[PDB]
Amino acid sequence: TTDGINYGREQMIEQNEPFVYDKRVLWKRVGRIRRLIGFKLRVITKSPVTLSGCQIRLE
C-alpha cells in the first residue's frame, strides 16, 4: 500500500514446501516508493507459519 488503506497488486510467492527446510522466501524487484509504502504479507495455509527477519534493499 501507498497510503495505508488501499493495497495494490498481489504477488504469489511459494513460502513453504513439504520436507524442504531451506527455501529463501524472497522477491527481487519491488517498485519505486513515491512517498510512503507498507507491506501486507498474507499467508493462507493448513500448516504452521514461522516468519522473521524481513529485510529490504532501498539503494
Binding site: 531451506d22 527455501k23 529463501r24 524472497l26 522477491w27 527481487k28 524487484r29
Partner: peptide, 15 residues
C-alpha cells in the same frame, strides 16, 4: 548472482 542454485534462488517467471 540473481537466480541460481548456488544462491538458493529460483528464477521468477517475470524475470
Amino acid at each position: 548472482g540473481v537466480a541460481s542454485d548456488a544462491t538458493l534462488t529460483d528464477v521468477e517467471p517475470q524475470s
